[PDB]
């Protein structure tokens, strides 16, 4: 399911970031970085959920997990 992040999507993200030319290994590097980020965030969210004794991951768990990292997000009930 990590191959679902296609090369055009990474190209689009780099173009919105202002990147003019892209190497060929950037895609795998970005997939690894994204996997690490998502692993940490989902681990924190699942910790919150288990503590709340739930089986569903809510938006509040994600928002608190991002506040835990320092990535405060507005517009999702915070």
């Amino acid at each position: 399911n990590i191959q679902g992040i296609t090369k055009p999507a990474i190209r689009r993200l780099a173009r919105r970031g202002g990147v003019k030319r892209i190497s060929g290994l950037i895609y795998e590097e970005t997939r690894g970085v994204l996997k690490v980020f998502l692993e940490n965030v989902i681990r924190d969210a699942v910790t919150y959920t288990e503590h709340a004794k739930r089986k569903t991951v809510t938006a509040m768990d994600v928002v608190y997990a991002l506040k835990r990292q320092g990535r405060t997000l507005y517009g999702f009930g915070g």
Binding site: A14, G17, V33, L34, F37, L38, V41, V62, V63, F76
Partner: peptide, 17 residues
């Protein structure tokens, strides 16, 4: 939750880029 995760992940990736 998925929407928030996607927003955060794209914002992070754009800052990194």
């Amino acid at each position: 939750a998925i929407g928030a995760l996607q927003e955060a992940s794209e914002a992070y990736l754009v800052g990194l880029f």
